């Protein structure tokens, strides 16, 4: 099932730090590819959706805006809804990330 690769657009920024990148969100096909791809971006390693707080990110916490255009670290959404829900991307260090960390989740 390959009809779906590379149509809804993301648009990505940084925050503290000046960077301009942008993706799709179905070239990832999978959860996996999406976290291997931040890592990529900034050449880092960005942490996992840990259950607990799923915000921290170590560094950077990888955040997007749902249909609702609230906006949360990827791993909330099974991959399903997510792809056709997410309509922006950005990621950005834990220390403005820890403002939207809603309810104990950065920092």
Do not use: N, Q
Not at 7 to 25: N, W
Not at 68 to 91: A, E, H, N, Q, Y
Request: negative net charge.
């Amino acid at each position: 099932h390959e009809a779906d690769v590379g149509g809804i657009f993301v648009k990505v920024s940084m925050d503290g730090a000046p960077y301009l990148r942008k993706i799709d969100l179905r070239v990832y096909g999978g959860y996996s590819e999406l976290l291997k791809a931040l890592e990529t971006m900034f050449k880092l390693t960005i942490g996992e959706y840990s259950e607990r707080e799923g915000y921290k990110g170590s560094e950077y916490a990888p955040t997007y805006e749902d249909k609702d255009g609230d906006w949360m670290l990827v791993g909330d959404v099974p991959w399903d809804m997510f792809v056709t829900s997410c309509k922006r991307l950005r990621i950005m260090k834990g220390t403005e990330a820890k403002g939207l960390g809603c309810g104990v989740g950065s920092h």
